[PDB]
Design a protein around this ligand. Structure first.
Ligand SMILES: O=C(COc1ccccc1P(=O)(O)O)NCC(F)(F)c1ccccc1F
Ligand SMILES: O=C(COc1ccccc1P(=O)(O)O)NCC(F)(F)c1ccccc1F
Ligand SMILES: [Mg+2]
Ligand SMILES: [Mg+2]
Ligand SMILES: [Mg+2]
Ligand SMILES: [Mg+2]
Ligand SMILES: [Mg+2]
Ligand SMILES: [Mg+2]
Lengths: 18, 236, 236, 18
């Protein structure tokens, strides 16, 4: 779950950063 | 139709084998073959269809992002080392990604959405429709991009209307739909306020009616509820 | 030749982009195009060629193993639920894996081995030849399997003879060759004693002449030395 | 390195077990 959560956060963060 | 001569049940079986082997292209191909038999999909079968294509386009999106990042460092003040190669390869990935999205949207329009009777299944396919237009939107430009955004919103919005009327607030498909429509608002439609608003409302209404959790799917529901809260952490 | 019209340098560039994007099929395709220009490969380019195809066939082997494991549980006393599906899909993966191995061995035979001048490069391609015959051996049967085993041994053995004569005991290619030939003995040729013997000798001779470590590649060398020791742990 | 090592051990172990 926390793995799915981490992946989600990284993907969602990508948009914010780039 | 490379799957036209294979039994429906055998295609469903091989999709599951492909899932275990992490062969998502194959899995998508098998599920496409199953859909083309013309029968409705069970809950289990819809999830297989989604998992397959989500992972395929997910790999393509990931690759697109890597190449896009590389391309940002290049074509820039200081890093004067350009060449057409990065763009060309990125466009190659882009074209394939578009090809897969078009395949999925094709299956949805012919013939999963119209053949759906259950309200849960109609929302599921409308959510999918919204998703694969969203993925097209991430790499599109100009008038093409505008049409894509409108199609995504329209699919999501109809899904939302049905889900609010027919499904409890903790239903995983309802939650998953609101989550992704929230993402649409933030990342595609350039409406972060509406993204936060929807995400929050969805979470609070799920909590307000937590008693509606289903024995069959509460793990899915709680996970999406956590994802909503995590996106809110990032976005605020 | 889908890569025939692209510049050699551009193909090498796109191989590296594909590596970063973890697009190993594409990477293999680009490096195949580069090889077919007819020039020798630099050290850097040989490694790209190997990394690409190693990962492609590696994914196929992994998938093959998953399906093979599933097939073991089925077709068995107690678990009476057979059907041809598992076999069929496993054979599909098998055929594709054979296709990739044949492509690689084709590139090696025409035209990397004969065009090689440097002793390091000749060993590199002979090691590769041994490897891709080994991968064919893992899924072959009957007289086909016998021919494959002999071809693997012959390629490995010639590589070993050249490497003992021309390269120091800590050279990463020499070490990598002995490691994989050791694996061949254990997993293919059914000679675990010779596998242990070779692995041990290689490690001890590397340690005995540790001073020969190269500034350019000692990290590769020490890693393979550790892998040798790890295989010895498992095998004894 | 230990990741490459772990993968190697698991792959090599597969043959021994199956
Ligand atoms: O991780 C991501 C990052 O984003 C993507 C990555 C791969 C494929 C699709 C997407 P997305 O842009 O969210 O549709 N999303 C959450 C999720 F894994 F999908 C997900 C997981 C569990 C439940 C719902 C759900 F949605
Ligand atoms: O992990 C494995 C397991 O086995 C495979 C997995 C994927 C592809 C090929 C093989 P193999 O059967 O060893 O040729 N092998 C070590 C290695 F990663 F290759 C390796 C790594 C570093 C240096 C040398 C070397 F050899
Ligand atoms: Mg029928
Ligand atoms: Mg394009
Ligand atoms: Mg709202
Ligand atoms: Mg030229
Ligand atoms: Mg076969
Ligand atoms: Mg020996």
């Amino acid at each position: 779950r926390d793995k799915i959560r981490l992946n989600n956060a990284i993907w969602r963060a990508w948009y914010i950063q780039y | 139709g490379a799957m036209g001569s294979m039994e429906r049940a055998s295609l469903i079986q091989k999709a599951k084998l492909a899932e275990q082997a992490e062969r998502y292209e194959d899995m998508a191909a098998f599920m496409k073959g199953a859909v083309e038999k013309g029968e409705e999909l069970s809950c289990e079968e819809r999830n297989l269809l989604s998992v397959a294509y989500k992972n395929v386009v997910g790999g393509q999106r990931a690759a697109w992002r890597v190449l896009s990042s590389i391309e940002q460092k290049s074509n820039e003040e200081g890093s004067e080392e350009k060449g057409p190669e990065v763009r060309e390869y990125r466009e190659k990935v882009e074209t394939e990604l578009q090809g897969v999205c078009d395949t999925v949207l094709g299956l949805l329009d012919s013939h999963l959405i119209k053949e759906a009777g259950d309200a849960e299944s109609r929302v599921f396919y409308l959510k999918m429709k919204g998703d694969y237009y969203r993925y097209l939107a991430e790499v599109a430009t100009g008038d093409d991009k505008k049409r894509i955004i409108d199609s995504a919103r329209s699919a999501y919005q109809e899904a939302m209307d049905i889900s609010k009327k027919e499904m409890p607030p903790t239903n995983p498909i309802r939650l998953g739909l609101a989550l992704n429509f929230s993402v649409f608002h933030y990342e595609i439609a350039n409406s972060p306020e509406e993204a936060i608003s929807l995400a929050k409302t969805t979470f609070d209404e799920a909590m307000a009616d937590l008693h509606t959790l289903s024995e069959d799917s509460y793990k899915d529901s709680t996970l999406i509820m956590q994802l909503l809260r995590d996106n809110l952490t990032l976005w605020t």
